[PDB]
RNA sequence: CAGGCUGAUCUUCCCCAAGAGUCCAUAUCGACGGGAUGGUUUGGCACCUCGAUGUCGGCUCGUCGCAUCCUGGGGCUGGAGCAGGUCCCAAGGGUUGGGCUGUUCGCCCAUUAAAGCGGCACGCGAGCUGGGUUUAGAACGUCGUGAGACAGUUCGGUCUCUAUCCGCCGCGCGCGUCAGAAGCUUGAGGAAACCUGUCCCUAGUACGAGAGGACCGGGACGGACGAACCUCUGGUAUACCAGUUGUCCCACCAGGGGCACGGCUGGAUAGCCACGUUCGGACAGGAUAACCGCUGAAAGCAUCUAAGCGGGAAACCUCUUCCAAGACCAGGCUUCUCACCCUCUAGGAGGGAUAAGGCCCCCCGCAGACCACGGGAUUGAUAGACCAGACCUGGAAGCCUAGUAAUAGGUGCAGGGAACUGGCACUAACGGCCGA
RNA sequence: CACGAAUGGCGUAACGACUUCUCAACUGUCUCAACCAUAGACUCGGCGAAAUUGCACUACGAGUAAAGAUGCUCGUUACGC
RNA sequence: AAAGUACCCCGGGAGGGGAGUGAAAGAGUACCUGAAACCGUGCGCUUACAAUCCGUCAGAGCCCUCGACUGGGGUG
């Protein structure tokens, strides 16, 4: 793969191995005018998009009676650390059926 | 207009002697 | 859209001259105590014996 | 006004000093030998001719080989000029000077010229950004067609520079400005921000920006 | 293999997959066939990727060759004769020869045959 | 991408219930509002008891949108809900509270009272 | 219907000022009367066409004029400031989306820096629509004894054509540029582009009784528009993976296949794309417009002018991007072959064979209607295969354990697989026609 | 202006490929287009029409003219196919 | 007047070239004479920077021809 010789610096090895289906607890660095903070996003991993720095992953909270869905680059400087707390098996690459579902029917089952 | 005026000023050419067959 | 005029004797010829044939441009093969000759794309098949030159 | 030939090596993304994503088009400007220096006495202008890219000696044409033999240089793939302003700038080049991508210095702006992708006879909609006619409400066989092309009995013709239909792309183009994110000295690559014209592996002339 | 860029020969996508099956199953029987040159070039990457399944001996590969071809004498002799023959050779099991133009349509013919 | 016509169900109380977009402000031929961009609106559904009637023209800011946007550091947000908050002449919402997560782009836009309210900023 | 002449009527300016403006005709309005421009309205006329010049509004595409709607530069003000009025200059760019009506026009709605006016057969139906008008059907009001009639309403009502020529948008072939070739170029002459907002500082300072509130110059973030590109997000996917319904077939069970819109459904790399992310509109210089001037006569004084010398706008030149020596004034800087042979009515002759190079064939492409352009051609990584990865799908077949069974779990991040990446000659890149 | 009582007046459940207005659902009708497949178009081999036609080695601008010119005037512009 | 081409060769045939028959195939059953439109082949002269009711008049050059030792043709 061409442009492997430029990727090596940005590729962090702090990320633990996870897959789609897994409940993952992503802490994020929020830089604002008052102060730097660690906000934390908490939800189920929907997908992974592959290919070095360019790969991303998508997490789904469901907060206060509305779905929110937030993507990050996996090798972002802003991503601080990722705690993988419940691993679960979903029989699928990319879980777009969770968009429609709401409720208790969107509950993923642990391995 | 412009085309109407200019045709009738071809009367004064010296060859025409102050009259030109309009129509 | 219909042709308004009959096309001239000069103009009909000058277009019509572009409609031509080129080719072949032969190369000297050998087979069976004789040369013949052949197009260069068929130069492998001529000596190997997939084509027949009696036609 | 410095310049360098190179190739487009494809795109990636790299994170900032202040943690933003900048999308970066990777070019590799290899070691270019200045072959001939055009001078204002004989030619009537000032320019520098740059050689780039490795080629086999047997591939080279004898007319072309003798020009490189005059320079004292191993023959190359591509060659092109940098036109530069005034007489003074050609004073600091010597034939056989092998310049590299280290010169540009992080946070510069460039022009980055290069021939575009051919789109291959696109008409009207793709080429010029026309609107087509409506897809429904009667419309008989006009859904992507140009429409009218002219007035009537005066002028009784189509004007020159009417926008129709024909072969699109392979234009020389230019990006303008386009910040250099990072000069990498080892490997010989420049991370330039944003898109640069052309296919992956096409010839590309990076020079410092005239507008800047 | 790589998909066809242009319109699919046969005049359909389903016809193309059936056509390449009937061309391949004929080629492994006889060992030689003659077609139009575009059909000959389309057959090469199809035919070689059955011979790689042949030389790798397993039941798994007997199933996946049988997803195409659809004939028991051919899938036998593909694994019996042809498979262990080209166990020696790495790739490139097939060649193309030019057989001059067809009479009615001037379609350029080509013979496609096993290397041996 | 709120556009013209369309239907947003309001985040803030105020008895609005639902609103239809008339104009996206801040330019001529300006197509798309999203999150930080204001709109002119019109109340469709409404509630019997409230300080807004049915069918009155009001300003509003977007807060959730179902299309996703880049933000910065390649980090996108995407909601299930096209929502908005009806505002006063300047900036303060006439609705006294706000429901659901607003975008964190609101802080940049200066609606500091809206992000001061609401369960979270995200 | 359209063109032509005419210009009563319309339309844009103008002469004279009775006046109104506290006073003061000319800051701004300007009666009565007079003189012209424009051809854009209603007309007059009957000159071209009735062996046919086919039709209002809308859509698509525009192109020019300035009598300027906005942005830019000025004078005067009954111009404090902000915001105006009025007149001169200026055509580079920009001049929104909806509601009602067949509409044009118009009334309204929410915005905008602004929602300009016109010509081009009231531009544009061998480009499109057919709602309006204007055939045949039919009812209503009216007039007629009646057949029927009405720029009175109402509902329904076939839109034909394979581009010869010029024209325009792209692309080659053939000679030419005083020998034949190749590489990089010069720029005569063109084209494309040219929009503008808010907000923070300067400063609550100038200015004003307060209310209000700046020029000039800084800095940040925009909208619409254009061009590149595919890293990201998003769409597409007809030889990719898995799920699944009905039915026939592979002897049958298991496991697969054909057909049903690609049978349907969930994802989907490359490619092409925008809804995506980058970038652009310049910064200077020169000669000017209206206007402001300096020094100064004729005319002892005066005066921007008569001689001369300046300032001065998005216009005009140049700068920026792209094409370009078929630019017949056919250019320049290099490098490479540079040499033979015969015939004749023997001279800017006709061949023949070549050299430096070109083309055809051959292997292809992210170049492509064809052609062309760009690579590769055995001293070879151009394409296929094979081997490895990337990436996509989501846990294959077989055997085994559990379950009375649908099914579940372990061998196993498995198996399968196209475009992206390297390695590897295994298959296919094997001899003719031009050319001083 | 100018409805009217069997050229019937005023209503009327059910019915209508009738005309009219509104509503929810859904949608490439649209904002604003994008991509894929097939059939023509395009290339090569074969066969092989047609309407039409005073001529031809058929530019453009401002004019003039039976009052809208490829052909007339004066310029400008244009290598052959 | 059939004397309608025996025979040989090219070819799958058709069709032809020799050979014959006849006064003549310049009469071959596609048949007396065989015009023009239209359709080719060869040979001169001209033409690829030029706006052509396609002619006309002036006219360079080139190519044939006659006649003494310049008259006519073709081209433009
Ligand atoms: Mg007049
Ligand atoms: Mg459309
Ligand atoms: Mg259609
Ligand atoms: Mg494809
Ligand atoms: Mg099928
Ligand atoms: Mg008339
Ligand atoms: Mg007319
Ligand atoms: Mg008449
Ligand atoms: Mg006629
Ligand atoms: Mg003016
Ligand atoms: Mg019209
Ligand atoms: Mg029509
Ligand atoms: Mg027309
Ligand atoms: Mg109608
Ligand atoms: Mg009566
Ligand atoms: Mg009907
Ligand atoms: Mg044509
Ligand atoms: Mg057509
Ligand atoms: Mg104050
Ligand atoms: Mg990619
Ligand atoms: Mg059976
Ligand atoms: Mg079974
Ligand atoms: Mg079947
Ligand atoms: Mg899908
Ligand atoms: Mg894709
Ligand atoms: Mg080549
Ligand atoms: Mg009665
Ligand atoms: Mg009665
Ligand atoms: Mg009655
Ligand atoms: Mg009745
Ligand atoms: Mg009634
Ligand atoms: Mg009925
Ligand atoms: Mg094609
Ligand atoms: Mg054909
Ligand atoms: Mg004219
Ligand atoms: Mg003439
Ligand atoms: Mg005869
Ligand atoms: Mg002339």
From TrEMBL, chain B:
InterPro entries: bL37_actino (IPR058090)
Region span, Disordered: 1-23
Lineage top rank: taxon: Bacteria
NCBIfam families attached to this UniProt entry: ribo_Myco_bL37
Listed name of the protein: Uncharacterized protein
Native source species: Mycolicibacterium smegmatis (strain ATCC 700084 / mc(2)155)
């Amino acid at each position: 793969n061409t442009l492997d010789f430029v990727d090596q610096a940005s590729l962090r090895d702090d990320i633990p191995t996870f897959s789609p289906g897994d409940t993952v607890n992503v802490h994020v660095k929020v830089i604002e005018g008052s102060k730097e903070r660690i906000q934390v996003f908490k939800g189920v991993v929907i997908r992974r998009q592959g290919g070095g720095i360019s790969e991303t992953f998508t997490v789904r909270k469901e907060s206060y009676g509305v779905g929110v869905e937030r993507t990050f680059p996996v090798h972002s400087p802003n991503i601080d650390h990722i705690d993988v707390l419940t691993r679960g098996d979903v029989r699928r690459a990319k879980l777009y059926y969770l968009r429609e579902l709401r409720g208790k029917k969107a509950k993923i089952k642990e391995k | 207009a412009k085309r109407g005026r200019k045709k009738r000023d071809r009367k004064h050419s010296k060859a025409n002697h102050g009259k030109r067959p309009n129509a | 859209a219909v042709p308004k005029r009959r096309m001239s004797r000069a103009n009909t010829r000058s277009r019509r001259a572009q409609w031509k044939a080129e080719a072949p441009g032969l190369v000297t093969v050998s087979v069976a105590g004789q040369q013949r000759k052949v197009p260069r794309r068929l130069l492998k098949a001529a000596r190997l014996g997939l084509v027949d030159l009696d036609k | 006004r410095k310049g360098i030939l190179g190739t487009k090596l494809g795109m990636t993304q790299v994170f900032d000093e202040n943690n933003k994503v900048v999308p970066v088009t990777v070019v590799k400007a290899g070691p270019n030998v200045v072959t001939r220096i055009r001078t204002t006495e004989r030619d009537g202008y000032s320019a520098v001719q740059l050689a780039y890219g490795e080629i086999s000696p047997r591939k080279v044409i004898k007319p072309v080989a003798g020009q490189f033999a005059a320079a004292g240089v191993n023959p190359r793939r591509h060659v092109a000029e940098l036109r530069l302003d005034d007489e003074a700038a050609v004073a600091e080049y010597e034939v056989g000077q092998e310049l590299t991508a280290e010169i540009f210095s992080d946070g510069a702006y460039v022009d980055v010229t290069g021939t575009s992708k051919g789109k291959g006879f696109a008409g009207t909609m793709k080429r010029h950004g026309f609107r087509g006619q409506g897809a429904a409400h009667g419309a008989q066989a006009v859904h992507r067609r140009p429409g009218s092309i002219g007035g009537c009995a005066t002028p009784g013709r189509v004007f020159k520079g009417t926008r129709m239909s024909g072969r699109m792309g392979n234009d020389r183009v230019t990006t303008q400005n386009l910040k250099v994110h990072k000069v990498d000295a080892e490997n010989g690559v420049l991370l330039i921000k944003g898109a640069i014209p052309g296919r992956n592996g096409g010839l590309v002339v990076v020079r410092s920006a005239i507008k800047r | 293999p790589k998909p066809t860029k242009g319109p699919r020969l046969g005049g359909s996508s389903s016809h193309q997959s059936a056509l390449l099956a009937n061309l391949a199953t004929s080629l492994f029987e006889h060992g030689r066939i003659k077609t139009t040159e575009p059909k000959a070039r389309a057959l090469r990457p199809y035919a070689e990727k059955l011979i790689t399944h042949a030389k790798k001996g397993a039941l798994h590969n007997r199933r996946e060759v049988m997803k195409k071809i659809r004939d028991k004498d051919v899938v036998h002799t593909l694994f019996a004769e042809i498979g262990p023959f080209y166990a020696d050779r790495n790739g490139g099991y097939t060649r193309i020869i030019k057989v001059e133009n067809r009479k009615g349509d001037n379609a350029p013919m080509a013979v496609i045959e096993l290397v041996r | 991408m709120i556009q013209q016509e369309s239907r947003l169900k309001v985040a803030d109380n105020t008895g609005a219930k639902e609103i239809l977009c008339i104009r996206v402000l801040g330019g001529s031929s300006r197509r798309y509002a999203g999150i930080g961009d204001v709109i002119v609106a019109t109340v469709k559904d409404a509630i019997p008891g409230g300080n807004v009637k049915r069918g009155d023209v009001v300003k509003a800011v977007v807060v959730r949108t179902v299309k996703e946007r880049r933000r910065a550091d390649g980090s996108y947000i995407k909601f299930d809900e096209n929502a908005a908050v009806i505002i006063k002449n300047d900036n303060d919402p006439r609705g006294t509270r706000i429901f659901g997560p607003v975008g964190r782009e609101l802080r940049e836009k200066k609606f500091m009272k809206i992000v001061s309210l609401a369960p979270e900023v995200l």
